[PDB]
Design a protein around this nucleic acid. Structure first.
Ligand SMILES: [Zn+2]
Lengths: 71, 25, 134, 221, 82, 129, 102, 220
RNA sequence: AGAACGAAAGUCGGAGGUUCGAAGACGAUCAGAUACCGUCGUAGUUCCGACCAUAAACGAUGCCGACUGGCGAUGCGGCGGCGUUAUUCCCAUGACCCGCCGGGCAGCUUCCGGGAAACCAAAGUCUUUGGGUUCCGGGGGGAGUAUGGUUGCAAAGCUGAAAC
RNA sequence: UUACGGCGGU
């Protein structure tokens, strides 16, 4: 079981902070490799230049060509 | 593929790149 | 292929339950009785009912079949309600006990109100049949 | 039975001991240690007769407390207990079930085999348990004359007598028939009740009609 | 159920088991209420009245209603007095 | 390795009242658990109890009345201030009409209703309803 | 799912039992998973009894029995039909089948 | 046009039993849906919750049946929840109204404090589990309203309760079990001993012994 | 934190080498047989010494404490009793017989209660949630991979991500 | 004794 006594606030608060590193949406927001990885760099929009029209093919039950670019 | 034989073909493969790195230091 | 379906057996049971006083172990009379007293849509199930009627004639003349007919229900009263025996099976005035249950009837305070001879339990403790297969 | 009119009345001890009624076989349920006296050297548990007398009166007070006499249902599944249940119900005016107890009698209100009783009394707890667990659905108090083997789940006035021998079962239905009539103006407590306890016993095999005519060449001819 | 005005604001009052003091519910269909007709002293016959005892289905299913209804016959002068 | 004896005492009472029993046996006695039981006897949840005085730690036999729902314990003896007391009430009481968080004050083991009649916040010791 | 309460094996208070070997296929099984069968077959093949007792040098000869203990892996106990696949509620009985000798 | 077949429906048509609250306290098994329709007629609305198509696989295609969840109740302390499968929607949904009135329980109402008038909330906090879903109904102060998901609020408003804090854990997207869990919580508001229910009950006379006239004199 | 021991396989060294037997050789069977099957057979299997420290190392259930149904049986102690059998023609202890008490490996029944259910007398005493304390889980993969440290003669072990 | 496969979406 867990710790319950009026003296274990060091064990409880240290056991919570290292078990927070085990869900994604805390760890992608607090470990910093995930914001040094997304090409927006932590933003919502980005201007860029177009290199190539490229058409990817749709997934498993569908069949169409999704029109994409190579910004 | 069986998990103990997925283990073998990556234990065989991690000694293959433990040697490539050791080769080209 | 002889085995008789449920409508043959059920309708023949309601004849023998209800018109037992008119029937017998002759096939060719029961065929005429069941023609007159039932409503039978064709001739083939008529005498296929009547044959099962004669079968149960030899069957209920032997013993208590599922037979709520008035005679087979009345004669059992001569067993369960009669046979009040002229002597009793509880009244023999020489009945055995063991010396532990003479102690039981003494703290009921009936030790001197009864005759109640004792029998000693023979030495033993050889109950509890032996364990294990063989 | 805290009275003097309801005391043990020593003649029945001569009837109890001449029918079994105090011999419980070899193991006991944990809820019947209060009813038992001691174990023999045979292993047979013998039963305090003061305890089985006081419950039989207590069972009788429940049956007298039912207003309609044709409303208590008296039931039996095994054969040793089917003759007693027929003329217990004739005596105290109950309604019997002998033979197989069809499941769905107390709770399935559609078919015409629907009895709706207020109190039920049983020959045997573990051998006639289908009416017990079905009384559990329809909030119905149950008496069951029980032996030391028998488990005591839904029973209420479990009579700790016997349910194995044929002399014991018929006498206990006789003793319960006698006293439930004697708590009315039917038997005065004074004269002995002339209905014989041999009348409620389980019936002999087929030599019945043979033995009686072998000693009746002087009454018919 | 005795508000501050002092009134009964309650659909009914439920029974409770004379063995384990707990409430018989509205659809506990194993709960019995049964009568014990006591007898008058001198003649030993049925005098007209009785006593009622309610046994809830949870303590009736556990198998000690016979221990129960003897014990509340023990307190109420019917049993043996030994 | 009986770290709390009030926790063990109140667990045994709670198992037996849901079982249907009329008497329990509480095998170690202390003065903390006899002043716990003489808060719920006075409110009326248990009855006559005897302390069986022996020369090691005594036993207690309690007569269960049936009116007890749960008699749990808060096993870290948390401290409660009188500003903090009202939110301890609605966490572990079933209603506001009945049930008591019983807590040890400087002036004795009390109720929560008795404790705010005085002005003497303390350490929360257990609850019962 | 756990199929059986014991794990098909009669070990409770141990860590390890001896391996024994199957009789027909020689497979390594533990001593308490293995399906045992003790055979007390008479060596004379009972059709051939009244052809040797007349050829005997006695008038009443006690014919010796043969006492061979079999034990099987359960992959060969099921195929040889010495045990049978059972229903999920007729499984909780450890009583053996009847004998039916005459 | 209803002739009864049981004792309990027999004593209600001739108007010898009055105002259901005693056959609740003698814990009768109600058998016919006309008894509850007899007392609580013209005070019952019947609205359904969900019609879900359960189905089974067969040798030739699939048996497709329908599973109706209906809640019935007045606004003064009575609720039912009935569930019935049938092959077709309209006949499944019709027989569930019978099964919902046939299983009707009284809900107990209480106060948050300041017991000033008509009771408005649950007397204590209660719980109902059904499979994995536990519904916790918590007494709210006066003037709150029902703070819950829609489908337990459909049954609490149909229980004649004013205001109730509510929490819930589990697969609450399992409408049938999330309706029977909250129905179980309002099925045990009277199965809970509060200190206004301490004094030992006087036992009145049950209708099977108090009405033995109409069975013996009139039925026979 | 830091240690002790830890199946089998494996490594280093020495004894030994019957049987079995990875590898390999062949004979078959096969569309193909680098498999099943058969004949032979190296390392290995056995012992001593030194290492490695992992298993479906599983009751897939951490340890300590308490409370909460029943029944028969078993193993080891202890206590009490009819009797039976031992040199005993008397003994005391042995063997059985009937119980009780404690610790144990389990079983059978149960609407104790629990649980998503299989099932569990614990996996119960839990929204009526708090007996102590340790380890550990957070959708599936990538991945027990990468790299850093560290242990090892090696094989590898422990620690252990992210991009996607 | 031998019995190996069965396009994608519906
Ligand atoms: Zn084999």
């Amino acid at each position: 079981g867990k710790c319950r006594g009026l003296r274990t606030a060091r064990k409880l608060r240290s056991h919570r902070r290292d078990q927070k590193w085990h869900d994604k949406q805390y760890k992608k927001a607090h470990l910093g490799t995930a914001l040094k990885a997304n090409p927006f760099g932590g933003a919502s929009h980005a201007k860029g230049i177009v290199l190539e029209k490229v058409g990817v093919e749709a997934k498993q039950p569908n069949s169409a060509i999704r029109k994409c670019v190579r910004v | 593929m069986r998990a103990k034989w997925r283990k073998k073909r990556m234990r065989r493969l991690k000694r293959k790149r433990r040697k490539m790195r050791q080769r080209s230091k | 292929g002889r085995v008789r379906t449920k409508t043959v057996k059920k309708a023949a049971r309601v004849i023998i339950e209800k018109y037992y006083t008119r029937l017998g172990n002759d096939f060719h009379t029961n065929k005429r009785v069941c023609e007159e007293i039932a409503i039978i849509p064709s001739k083939k199930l008529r005498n296929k009912i009547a044959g099962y009627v004669t079968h149960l004639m030899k069957r209920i003349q032997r013993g208590p079949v599922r037979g709520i007919s008035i005679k087979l229900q009345e004669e059992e009263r001569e067993r369960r309600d009669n046979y009040v025996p002229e002597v009793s099976a509880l009244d023999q005035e020489i009945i055995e006990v063991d010396p532990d249950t003479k102690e039981m009837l003494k703290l009921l305070d009936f030790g001197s109100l009864s005759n109640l001879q004792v029998t000693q339990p023979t030495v033993g403790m050889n109950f509890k049949t032996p364990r294990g297969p063989v | 039975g805290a009275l003097d009119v309801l005391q043990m009345k020593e003649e029945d001890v001569l009837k109890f001991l001449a029918a079994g009624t105090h011999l419980g076989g070899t193991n006991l349920d944990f809820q019947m240690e209060q009813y038992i006296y001691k174990r023999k050297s045979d292993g047979i548990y013998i039963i305090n007769l003061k305890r089985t007398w006081e419950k039989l009166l207590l069972a009788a007070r429940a049956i007298v407390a039912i207003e309609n006499p044709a409303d208590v249902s008296v039931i039996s599944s095994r054969n040793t207990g089917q003759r007693a249940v027929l003329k217990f119900a004739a005596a105290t005016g109950a309604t019997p079930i002998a033979g197989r107890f069809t499941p769905g009698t107390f709770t399935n209100q559609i078919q015409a085999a629907f009895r709706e009783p207020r109190l039920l009394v049983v020959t045997d707890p573990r051998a006639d348990h289908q009416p017990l667990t079905e009384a559990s659905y329809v909030n119905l108090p149950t008496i069951a004359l029980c032996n030391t083997d028998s488990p005591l789940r839904y029973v209420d006035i479990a009579i700790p007598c016997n349910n194995k021998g044929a002399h014991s079962v018929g006498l206990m239905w006789w003793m319960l028939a006698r006293e439930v009539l004697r708590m009315r103006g039917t038997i005065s407590r004074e004269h002995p009740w002339e209905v014989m306890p041999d009348l409620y016993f389980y019936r002999d095999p087929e030599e019945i009609e043979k033995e009686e005519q072998a000693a009746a060449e002087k009454a018919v001819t | 159920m005795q508000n501050d005005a002092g009134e009964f604001v309650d659909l009914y009052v439920p029974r409770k088991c004379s063995a384990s003091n707990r409430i018989i519910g509205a659809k506990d269909h194993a709960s019995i209420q049964m009568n014990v007709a006591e007898v008058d002293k001198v003649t030993g016959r049925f005098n007209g009245q009785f006593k009622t005892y309610a046994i809830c289905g949870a303590i009736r299913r556990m198998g000690e209603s016979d221990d129960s209804i003897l014990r509340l016959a023990k307190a109420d002068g019917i049993v043996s007095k030994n | 390795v009986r770290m709390n004896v009030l926790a063990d005492a109140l667990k045994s009472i709670n198992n037996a009242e849901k079982r249907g029993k009329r008497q329990v046996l509480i095998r170690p006695c202390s003065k903390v658990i006899v002043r716990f039981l003489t808060v719920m006897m006075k409110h009326g949840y248990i009855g006559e109890f005897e302390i069986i005085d022996d020369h090691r730690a005594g036993k207690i036999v309690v007569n269960l009345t049936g009116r007890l729902n749960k008699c749990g314990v808060i096993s870290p003896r948390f401290d409660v201030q009188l500003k903090d007391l009202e939110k301890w009430q609605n966490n572990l009481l079933p209603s506001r009409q009945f049930g008591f968080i019983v807590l040890t004050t400087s002036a004795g083991i009390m109720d929560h209703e008795e404790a705010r009649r005085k002005h003497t916040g303390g350490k929360i010791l257990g609850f019962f309803f | 799912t756990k199929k059986r309460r014991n794990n098909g094996r009669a070990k409770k208070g141990r860590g390890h039992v001896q391996p024994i070997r199957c009789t027909n296929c020689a497979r390594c099984v533990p001593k308490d998973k293995a399906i045992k069968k003790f055979v007390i077959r008479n060596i004379v093949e009972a059709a051939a009894v009244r052809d040797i007792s007349e050829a005997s040098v006695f008038d009443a000869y006690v014919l010796p029995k043969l006492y061979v203990k079999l034990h099987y892996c359960v992959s060969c106990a099921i195929h040889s039909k010495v045990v049978r696949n059972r229903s999920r509620e007729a499984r909780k009985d450890r009583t053996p089948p009847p004998r039916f000798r005459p | 046009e209803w002739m009864p077949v049981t004792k309990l429906g027999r004593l209600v048509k001739d108007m010898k039993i009055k105002s259901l609250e005693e056959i609740y306290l003698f814990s009768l098994p109600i058998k016919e849906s006309e008894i509850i329709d007899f007392f609580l007629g013209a005070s019952l609305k019947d609205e359904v919750l969900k019609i879900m198509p359960v189905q089974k696989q067969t040798r030739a295609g699939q048996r497709t049946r329908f599973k109706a969840f209906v809640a019935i109740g007045d606004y003064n302390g009575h609720v039912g929840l009935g569930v019935k499968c049938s092959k077709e929607v309209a006949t499944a949904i019709r027989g569930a109204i019978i099964l919902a009135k046939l299983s009707i329980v009284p809900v107990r109402r209480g106060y948050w404090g300041n017991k000033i008038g008509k009771p408005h909330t649950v007397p204590c906090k209660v719980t109902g589990r059904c499979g994995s879903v536990l519904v916790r109904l918590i007494p709210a102060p006066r003037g709150t309203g029902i703070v819950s998901a829609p489908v337990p609020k459909k049954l609490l408003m149909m229980a004649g309760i004013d205001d109730c804090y509510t929490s819930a854990r589990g697969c609450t997207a399992t409408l049938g079990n999330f309706a029977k869990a909250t129905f179980d919580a309002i099925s045990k508001t009277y199965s809970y001993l509060t200190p206004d229910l301490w004094k030992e009950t006087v036992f009145t006379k049950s209708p099977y012994q108090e009405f033995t006239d109409h069975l013996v004199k009139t039925h026979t």
